[PDB]
Structure formats: structure tokens, C-alpha cells
């Protein structure tokens, strides 16, 4: 990124080092990129990338027989550099992903197969997800939205560094209704104590998904406050994570929530599907059910939707009838100031202070007129 | 009902008796109707009819003060024949139905009050229903539709005489998924045994709603098969009840299901409302979710909707494109014969063999043309 084309004569790069790390710095300047691996490499005859690859072609209906499988193996990048394929096919058979009809040896997708493909889910993750859902449908808590959120809470990657001492403090202060959900999932208070007392991550044993469970329940709490319209600064102080890690999490959970919804629909689990089908939109914007209609407008996010709701505008229909200058004023009240704000400067009438995507700078007035204009266009398309 | 006006010269009535019951028969011929009671009569200072009456006028907003209450007491039929009112007002206060603001002594409705009124529910029944729902939301089974049905299964009157021996036979053969729902509700196997072994109805103690629970769970099983499109004859043989008692039950449960849905909506219980809001339509016709669209047509019931679904017509949209004579044929296949049916009689082309409400006799042809005609009119109103 050193050197602007058409602007600079040269691009300069400086790597600051010490005498001790002097040799490692030179290694980088002379270093070159490593050769590209296939990521489908084989004491592991089976592998995730291959299992998914084989599942996609069989369920999709472009690979039926055993001859089609090895023909596919020829097209891979792994074979370009110049058994394992057969192992993945059996794996799909053992775990009810694929069917075999002896037309000798022809493979067809199951309901679980077609569901996994439509859900864009990884076959390795689908097994635990399928069990987790069946476990939840045997005993489910409906008095709050926490248990539902847990099912759509992603835990395939760490989104933040969790302070366990902070976690235990929230555990005790946690209401009884949410402790019931914790117990029902696997959250044991004993494991939480062995985390604060001693910084033993363990996780060496495969059976230590016990760690992931507590990380997942911690995350669901964050997502619970998030769709409860709890301020980002409160969530930051309460949990110990920045706004960057949160936004990356909600956009991840919004997508994941859609996956579990599709997965539940293709298996015929209507009751479970019915509950989940409202959280994709709520996780995206971080809102409650009431603001779901307002946030259809492009410029209206969580903060702008709430202040317009609390001012009499509950729906797009109510927002189309709106007086523009009234919308503008309500927007002006949602701004965050360090001092308890909420002189006359008439030189700020042209200040473009509202950002969009692929944006021209919008004034607070122009944005308001756009919100009312868009609301009317949507109101007509609703008929 | 003896004597047709404009037809008969006299109407004759004969009461057949023996010598032993001779005196009781004469008592009827000379007998006259008893005076009409008020049904709001008072060791019972409080009474159901009064509590409901007082609740309706306060929540509705036509009675606020204490003066309005006794003014209402004057308009009653009980006072027409010429304390207790004050007792009912306190009862509504004790059970969170009504609020009191000391403008000395002014009464307003609570959320629980406004919910009960909108639900058309009796205040006496609302207390147990409110507890039952809160109990269900703490631990709910979603793998089947049984637990949801239990919440909308009415038990304020007996709809049939339950054979307990038959019940215990269905209990053992009952799958594990439905035994979990039974335990979760209150169905104890010990009580079922003390019913078959000994015909002890008990029910003298008020705390013996334990009887109602088992009667309610028995009923939910019937409703489960009913919306699973299990034949009426199978349900008759399996449970021991006639088709008359069943139809009276489903139309009762369809109405009740709507009540619990409204009740849940006014309390803000969205998750619970979401699950219940699909069973009013299914209980009415006795169908599965797939036939919900077809049964919008007036002439299409459960039986006609299924045979049209299994023949390629899944929606009203598919049914508007239908060839009339094809619909007619599919209908002809749904008819029940004692022999394994499903000569050429062309004299039955005018036989009106299909009944409607406020009906002219419809031929199987005319009905088919009406179904396709109605489907098209509905398809246009859907846009
Ligand atoms: K938006
Ligand atoms: K109908």
C-alpha cells in the first residue's frame, strides 16, 4: 500500500526493529509467499472440505453413481498437483445424510441431506445442531427470548475475549427465569467457578465442548440485550467488549438465524421454525418487534426507529403521512452528546451530517424528506 | 310440538306410564313452570355471575366509581324482586383484575382485566388458565402438537363418558414423546390405575381437579388424532365416543383456542400466541396445515380437501385452474361405501346428493362447478 499510482514518485516502506529482532526483519524483506495448499489434503482419511464437497454434488443431483464421484476427484485442485473419496461417501451414509440403492450403487439425498444443502450449513456442524434442536424441543422455555436466541447463537469462532470474573458476577445477578435456561442447556455453576478461580482453558480434550457451551450462553446474553435495545455503551461496560466485536457478532447471528430457520423448515419442524423466523430481522438491526415495520425504510436504523416510535410514528403508514420538518426534529433529538444536550447557528443549514452506503452527504433535512418519500413509495408497494 | 298449525284439527299427547309411576305422570300434566331465579343470588357473598358482571362494566369503561356500582345493582333482575356488590369489587382487587386509586375510590382495569374482557373468558376460569399458561412457558414440548392442544382443550363440561379401562390401554401403548407431555401436565399413572381398578369418581374435594386433568389429557388425545385427519370411525373405536360428541367438542375447542390466543396477545406473550394462532382453523375442520388453504372454499371440508390435495390440487390457485369435470371425479372417489367400492346408471345425472347450509340440493357436477367458481373469486380477492 506504499505508492499512489499517478501521485507519488516512489513508495517507501520502513520496518522498525531492534538488534535482537534484526534477523527476523530481513527474513520478511527477502521472504516470498508459500505455495498454495489444497485444503482437501488427507491420519485423516476423511476431511470436512471433502465431505461438504461430496454432499453438494449428490444432493444437488449432478453426481449419482460411484463413477461420477471419482470423475469429480479429477477436477479438484488436489488432483492437479499430480481412496479418500470413498471414505466420505460412507460417512454420509453412516450419518443419514445420503441413501444407497443397490443400477448398482446409486446415491440419493435424504431429507437431512437436502436440508443441509438448503441451509448452507457444514455437514460436520449439522450433526451437533440437529441434536441440539431435538434436545430443545423436548423441553423449551418460552417465557423469555433467551432460549430461542441460544439456538441461533453462533459459536464456530471467538468474537471476543471473555472476562470470566465479569461473567460470574452477571451469573449471580441473573434472574431465575434465565438461570433455568442456563441449566437446561449445560451451563454448570461449578465450571464457571473453575474459570474465574483458575485461568485453565483446557480445551485439549474433544469432549471439552463444555467450554463452547459457556461461551455460547455468554454470547446469547449479549444478543438478548442487543435485541432489547440496550445501548452499545452499556453492553460494552457490562460484558467487556467493544462495539466492533458486537456488530461483527450480530451480522453473523442474523445470517446464522436464517440458516437454522431454513433447516427447520425443510425437516418439517413447523413449531420450531415459527419461533425462529422472527429473530433474523431483530438480530440484524438490534430492535424489538415493534420497530420491525419502521426499519424497512433504508435510512431508519435501531436508534432512529425508536425515537420515531416514541413520538407517534409506529408504522410506515404513519410515517408516510408525516410532516417532513417534524421527522427532521425527532431525528435531531436522537443525537448523542457528551454533555446533557438532548446559540443559534444558521450556517449549519448545509452541513452534510448523515452518512449512507454509496453515499452523498445528506443534511438532516434532506434525510428526513428521503425517509418520508421512501415511506410513501413503500406504502404503495404494500397494496 | 303436538299440533301443526293449519294442518291438524287437534294435537294429541300421550305419556305412557305404569301403575307405580302413575302419580308422577299426573304431576306433569297438572304441573306448571317454576318462577325465574336471578342466578346472581347470594354462605356465598361472592358469585361468578356477579364478578363477571362487575368486571365487564369497569374494564369497558362505563363504571368507574363506587356510586356507579350500586346504580348498576339497581338495574339487575335480582333487585327487581324487591353489600354483595362490594365483595366482588374487592375480589377483583385481590386478584389483580382491577386497580384502585384513592377522586376518592376510582376503579380502573389492569392488563389482566382488559385481557379477560377481550377473551370473552370467565374471571373464575381465568385465574387457573393464567397459571396454567405460565406453568407451560417454563417447560414446553415442541416436538409434537400435543402440549399446545392441551392449552386449548376445554374442560368446563363433560362431552362424553370416558371408559377408564380403555384409557389405560392407550396409556401403555402411548409413545414416549407423549408420555413426557402427560407427566409435564399432572397425569400420574397411579391415579389412572385407581380409576380402572375401582370406579371411584370422588371429586367431592375441591382439590380434586386431578380428575379434570386426566379428563383433559384424554380429550387432547382425541383432538390430536382429529387434526391428524384420523377417520371418525377409528376415533370412535379407539376412544369409545360417538361422532356427535366429537363434533360438539371440536367446535367448542375451535372457539376456545381463539380465546386463549387473544388472551395471550393482550398480555404480550408473543411466543405463546404464535404457536396457538394456527390451531383454531385446524380444530374447526379437523385438518393438517396443508389443507388450511383449500378449506377456505365453502364446500370443501376435511375429506374433500384431502382427496383434492392427494390428486394435485394443493392450493386455491391450483383449484381455480382446475377442469370442472376433473374436480367432480375426485369428489366421487371420496364417498364412503360399506363394500370396497372406492352397472352404469345415467338416471342419476340429476340426483341432488350434496348438502349445504341454507341449501338447495346440489349435484356432484354442480358442486364441482361451484368449487371452481368460488376458487376463482377467492383467487382474485387475494390480489
Ligand atoms: K434500514
Ligand atoms: K369449508
Q: What is the DSSP string of B277-303?
A: TTHHHHHHHT--GGGGTGGGSTT--HH
Q: Are B253 and B221 in contact (CB under 8 A)?
A: no
Q: Are A270 and B282 in contact (CB under 8 A)?
A: no
Q: Which residue of B has its CA nearest to A142?
A: B137
Cα B54 from Cα B335, distance rounded (Å)? 52
B164: Cβ contacts below 8 Å, ≥ 6 apart: B192, B195, B196, B199
Residue (of B43, B105, B21, B94) closest to B68 by Cα position? B105
Stated resolution in angstroms: 2.9
C-alpha cell at A353: 451530517
- Cα A374 → chain centroid: 28
Q: At what angle do helices B324-332 and B364-381 cross, to 10 degrees?
A: 120
C-alpha cell at B109: 382495569
- Residue A39 Ramachandran class (φ > 0 left, ψ -120 to 50 alpha, else beta): left
Residue (of A282, A300, A291) closest to A374 by Cα position? A300
C-alpha cell at A242: 467493544
Cα A272 from Cα B141, distance rounded (Å)? 10
Instruction: Determine the distance separating the centroid of ligand 2 and the alpha carbon of B295, expressed in angstroms.
Output: 5
Residue (of B92, B107, B111) closest to B53 by Cα position? B92
- Are the beta carbons of A274 and B274 separated by less than 8 Å? yes
> Cα-flanking dihedrals φ and ψ of residue A354, to 5°?
-120, 125
B134 Cβ under 8 Å from any chain A Cβ: yes
Tell me if residue B203 falls in helix, strand or coil: coil
Write the burial class of residue B93 (CB in 10 Å: 0-12 exposed, 13-18 middle, 19+ buried): middle
Q: Are A40 and A50 in contact (CB under 8 A)?
A: yes
- Are the beta carbons of B137 and A141 separated by less than 8 Å? yes
Residue (of B296, B257, B263) closest to B277 by Cα position? B257
- Strand segments, DSSP code E, in chain A are 98-101, 106-109
Q: Are B68 and B57 in contact (CB under 8 A)?
A: yes
Tell me if residue A107 falls in helix, strand or coil: strand
Give, in order, the Cα–Cα distances in Å from B309 to each of A238, B273, B293, B294, B300.
55, 29, 10, 8, 11
- Are the beta carbons of A275 and B270 separated by less than 8 Å? no
Q: Are A227 and A145 in contact (CB under 8 A)?
A: yes
First to last CA, chain A: 51
Q: How many CB atoms lie within 10 A of CB A202?
A: 10
A141 Cβ under 8 Å from any chain B Cβ: yes
Q: Are A192 and A214 in contact (CB under 8 A)?
A: yes
C-alpha cell at B283: 380444530
- Helix/strand/coil percent split, chain A, to 5: 55, 5, 45
Q: Are B256 and B243 in contact (CB under 8 A)?
A: no
Give, in order, the Cα–Cα distances in Å from A299 to each of A12, A249, A295, A362, A369.
41, 22, 8, 11, 11
Tell me if residue A33 falls in helix, strand or coil: coil
- Dihedral angle over CA of A94, A97, A98, A99, nearest 10: 70
Write the burial class of residue B180 (CB in 10 Å: 0-12 exposed, 13-18 middle, 19+ buried): middle
Q: What angle do CA A29, A35, A38 make, to 5 degrees?
A: 150
Q: Are B223 and B250 in contact (CB under 8 A)?
A: yes
- Are the beta carbons of B145 and A271 separated by less than 8 Å? yes
Residue (of B66, B61, B59) closest to B111 by Cα position? B59
A271 Cβ under 8 Å from any chain B Cβ: yes
C-alpha cell at B195: 380409576
> Cα-flanking dihedrals φ and ψ of residue A113, to 5°?
-70, -55
Q: Are A46 and A88 in contact (CB under 8 A)?
A: yes
Q: Are A315 and A293 in contact (CB under 8 A)?
A: yes
Q: How many CB atoms lie within 10 A of CB A229?
A: 17
Cα A296 from Cα A300, distance rounded (Å)? 7
Cα B101 from Cα B107, distance rounded (Å)? 7
Cα B46 from Cα B93, distance rounded (Å)? 13
Q: Are B105 and B66 in contact (CB under 8 A)?
A: yes
Q: What angle do CA B146, B151, B155 make, to 5 degrees?
A: 105
Instruction: Determine the distance separating the centroid of ligand 2 and the alpha carbon of B272, expressed in angstroms.
Output: 27
Cross-strand pairs, B101:
B106
Instruction: Determine the distance separating the centroid of ligand 1 and the alpha carbon of A95, expressed in angstroms.
Output: 41
Q: Are B6 and B20 in contact (CB under 8 A)?
A: no
Q: How many helices (H) and strands (E) does chain A have?
A: 19, 2
Cα A83 from Cα A46, distance rounded (Å)? 10
Give, in order, the Cα–Cα distances in Å from B31 to each of A120, B23, B25, B26, B79.
79, 12, 10, 8, 28
Give, in order, the Cα–Cα distances in Å from B90 to each of B75, B115, B143.
21, 19, 43
Cα B208 from Cα B201, distance rounded (Å)? 10
Kindly report each contact of residues A309-316 with a partner whose C-beta sits within 8 Å and lies 24 or more positions away, as own/partner: A314/A290, A316/A375, A316/A378, A316/A379, A316/A382
> Cα-flanking dihedrals φ and ψ of residue B61, to 5°?
90, 35
Instruction: Determine the distance separating the centroid of ligand 2 and the alpha carbon of B43, expressed in angstroms.
Output: 49
Q: How many helices (H) and strands (E) does chain B have?
A: 19, 2
Q: Are B65 and B54 in contact (CB under 8 A)?
A: no
C-alpha cell at B54: 362487575
Q: Are A274 and A260 in contact (CB under 8 A)?
A: no
How close B140 gets to chain A, by Cα (Å)?
5
Residue (of A134, A113, A139) closest to A57 by Cα position? A113
A133 Cβ under 8 Å from any chain B Cβ: no
Q: Are A354 and A364 in contact (CB under 8 A)?
A: yes
Q: Are A274 and B275 in contact (CB under 8 A)?
A: yes
Q: How many CB atoms lie within 10 A of CB B159?
A: 19
- Are the beta carbons of A143 and B143 separated by less than 8 Å? no
Report the sign of the C-alpha dihedral through residues B66, B70, B72, B78, in that order: positive
Cα A55 from Cα B102, distance rounded (Å)? 71
What is the bridge-based pairing of β-strands B98-101 and A106-109? Answer: unpaired
First to last CA, chain B: 51
- The ligand that comes nearest to the alpha carbon of residue B300 is 2
Q: How was this structure determined?
A: X-ray
Q: At what angle do helices A210-226 and A243-266 cross, to 10 degrees?
A: 100
Q: Which residue of A has its CA nearest to B135?
A: A143
Residue (of A247, A243, A278) closest to A261 by Cα position? A278
Residue (of A251, A254, A262, A300) closest to A279 by Cα position? A254
Smallest Cβ–Cβ distance between B139 and the set A139, A270, A272 belongs to A139
Q: What angle do CA B337, B342, B346 make, to 5 degrees?
A: 85
Cα B375 from Cα B378, distance rounded (Å)? 5
Residue (of B109, B140, B148) closest to B266 by Cα position? B109
A135 Cβ under 8 Å from any chain B Cβ: no
Cα A88 from Cα A70, distance rounded (Å)? 12
- Helix/strand/coil percent split, chain B, to 5: 55, 5, 45
Amino acid at each position: 500500500r506504499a505508492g499512489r499510482k499517478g501521485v507519488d514518485t516512489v513508495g517507501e516502506s520502513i520496518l522498525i526493529c531492534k538488534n535482537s529482532e534484526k534477523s527476523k526483519g530481513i527474513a520478511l524483506l527477502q521472504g516470498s509467499l508459500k505455495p498454495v495448499r489444497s485444503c482437501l489434503q488427507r491420519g485423516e482419511e476423511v476431511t470436512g472440505s471433502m465431505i461438504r464437497a461430496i454432499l453438494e454434488i449428490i444432493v444437488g443431483g449432478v453426481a449419482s453413481t460411484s463413477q461420477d464421484m471419482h470423475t469429480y476427484a479429477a477436477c479438484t485442485f488436489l488432483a492437479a498437483s499430480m481412496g479418500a473419496i470413498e471414505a466420505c461417501v460412507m460417512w454420509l451414509l453412516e450419518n443419514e445424510f445420503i441413501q444407497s440403492t443397490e443400477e448398482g450403487k446409486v446415491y440419493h439425498p435424504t431429507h437431512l441431506g437436502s436440508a443441509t444443502l438448503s441451509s448452507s450449513l457444514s455437514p460436520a456442524d449439522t450433526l451437533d445442531i440437529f441434536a441440539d434442536l431435538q434436545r430443545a424441543m423436548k423441553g423449551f422455555v418460552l417465557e423469555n427470548d433467551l432460549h430461542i436466541l441460544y439456538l441461533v447463537t453462533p459459536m464456530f469462532e471467538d468474537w471476543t475475549t471473555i472476562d470470566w470474573y465479569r461473567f460470574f458476577c452477571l451469573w449471580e445477578k441473573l434472574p431465575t427465569s434465565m438461570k433455568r435456561v442456563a441449566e437446561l442447556v449445560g451451563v454448570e455453576e461449578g465450571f464457571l467457578a473453575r474459570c474465574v478461580k483458575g485461568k485453565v482453558v483446557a480445551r485439549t480434550e474433544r469432549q471439552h465442548r463444555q467450554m463452547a457451551i459457556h461461551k455460547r450462553f455468554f454470547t446469547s446474553l449479549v444478543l438478548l440485550d442487543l435485541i432489547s435495545e440496550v445501548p452499545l455503551r452499556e453492553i460494552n461496560q457490562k460484558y467487556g467488549c467493544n462495539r466492533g466485536q458486537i456488530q461483527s457478532l450480530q451480522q453473523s447471528a442474523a445470517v446464522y438465524a436464517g440458516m437454522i430457520t431454513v433447516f427447520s423448515n425443510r425437516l418439517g419442524w413447523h413449531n420450531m421454525e415459527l419461533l425462529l423466523s422472527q429473530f433474523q430481522k431483530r438480530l440484524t438491526f438490534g430492535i424489538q418487534r415493534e420497530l420491525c415495520d419502521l426499519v424497512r425504510v433504508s435510512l431508519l436504523n435501531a436508534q432512529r426507529a425508536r425515537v420515531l416510535y416514541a413520538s407517534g410514528f409506529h408504522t410506515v403508514a404513519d410515517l408516510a403521512r408525516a410532516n417532513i420538518v417534524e421527522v427532521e426534529v425527532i431525528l435531531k433529538n436522537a443525537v448523542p452528546f457528551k454533555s446533557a444536550r438532548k446559540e443559534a447557528v444558521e450556517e449549519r443549514r448545509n452541513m452534510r451530517t448523515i452518512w449512507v452506503t454509496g453515499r452523498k452527504g445528506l443534511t438532516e433535512r434532506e434525510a428526513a424528506a428521503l425517509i418520508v418519500e421512501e415511506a410513501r413509495m413503500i406504502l404503495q408497494q404494500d397494496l
